Amino acid sequence: HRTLLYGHAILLRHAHSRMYLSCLTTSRSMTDKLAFDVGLQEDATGEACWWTMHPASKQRSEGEKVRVGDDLILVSVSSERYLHLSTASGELQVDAS
Amino acid sequence: MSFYAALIDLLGRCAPEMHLIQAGKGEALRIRAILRSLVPLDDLVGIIS
């Protein structure tokens, strides 16, 4: 039991299916636009499962704490692309662009 | 067209040298894969041809 600190690697699991949230190795939408899909992983290992909460607003600073409902940016440890709500031609998909 | 040629050269210079970091470390291939997607081999052969 320990609180979170800004700029820390995170580990998120799916509550129901007991799988680890991670990224993929494939893209869609027929455009190059390198962006690996975001999907659950069978096992934690693979180096593509963790995410880091990097600075996103001037209100908070790197090395500080986090608060309730504090907006931030999540960056995949392996995929340098951020976790983005890709509002493409589809129904506002989520992609790691 | 010289702007893209220099851009291609710039990407080539920053590419990992060879398997001394590529085979051992996984960071070299990770950057190599990222830049590989930028320039697929399909267009490279067309340009040189």
Closest CA to A70 of A80, A81, A82, A59: A59
Interface mutation vs chain B, best among A24, A30, A34, most B CBs within 10 Å: A34
**CA separation for the pair B47, A67 (Å, rounded):** 53
- Name the structure determination technique: cryo-EM
**CA separation for the pair A41, A23 (Å, rounded):** 8
**CA separation for the pair A96, B46 (Å, rounded):** 30
Whether A24 has its CB under 8 Å from any CB of chain B: the answer is no
**CA separation for the pair B35, B6 (Å, rounded):** 15
Specify the resolution in Å: 3.3
Question: Of chain B residues 25-44, which have a CB less than 8 A from chain A?
Answer: 26, 30, 34, 37-38, 40
Paired strand residues for A39:
A22
Residue with tokens 């960071």: B27
